[PDB]
Amino acid sequence: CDPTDDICEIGVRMEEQLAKQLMMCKNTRDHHKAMGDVAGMNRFENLALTVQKDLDLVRYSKRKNEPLPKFHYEKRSFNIVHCNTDLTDSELEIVVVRGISYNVANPKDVDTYVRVEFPLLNDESFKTKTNVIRDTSSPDYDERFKVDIQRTNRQFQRIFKRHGVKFEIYSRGGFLRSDTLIGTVNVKLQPLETKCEIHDTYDLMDGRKQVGGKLEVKIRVRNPILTKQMEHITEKWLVLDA
Secondary structure, three states, X not given: OOOOOHHHHHHHHHHHHXXXXXXXXXXXXXXXXXXXXXXXHHHHHHXXXXXXXXXXXXXXXXXXXXXXXXXXXXXXXXXXXXXXXXXXXXXXXXXEEEEEOOOOOOOOOOOEEEEEEOOOOOOOOOEEEOOOEOOOOOOOOOEEEEEEOOOOOHHHHHHHHHOEEEEEEEEOOOOOOOOEEEEEEEEEOHHHHOOOEEEEEEEEEOOOOEEEEEEEEEEEEOOOOOHHXXXXXXXXXEEEOO
């Protein structure tokens, strides 16, 4: 749009608003899917469907040359403050789930453990580690660690915006033998600004250089960092007439 063309810009914002609403539908749908909640899942998929229809209607009016569709505001109940109720408002949880086929020299008794480093106030702190699984290239750690955050501190918001959690995978050197760094995994925290968990599997790295196997990890909060402004969107749900 030309910067003086206000009706054009309204049209752009209509589409942006609906695209943001679509994103919220899919995210929430995906949270309910991950939690074995079939009914919430279909619910927010159906909400996504209606948002997409309106998105298509607006794009179509623009593809031809018709007036923008009339619209109005409604509300939608997302329950953003209450996904992962198992967690305090102040709590971030890290789950080291499993290693997958580390590229080591041993088959069995490769013995492994994972160190976790989570940045805290005035860089940094919080460090911990998993137990030592024994005798497998594909370990099944299943350990959860909780830490305290301050959503209020703008430098904690810094950390979620820009920074991440470091996972170091170590082989347990035996008698008079030190431990070997098998590989590193670094997971950015910023998806937690609008989502309430990260869950993926990541390649063990050396540099700059993929090592071999993978590590599967979860990072979970009670609600997204930017829950407050997500709620504002849900209070003015843009919906086309009719």
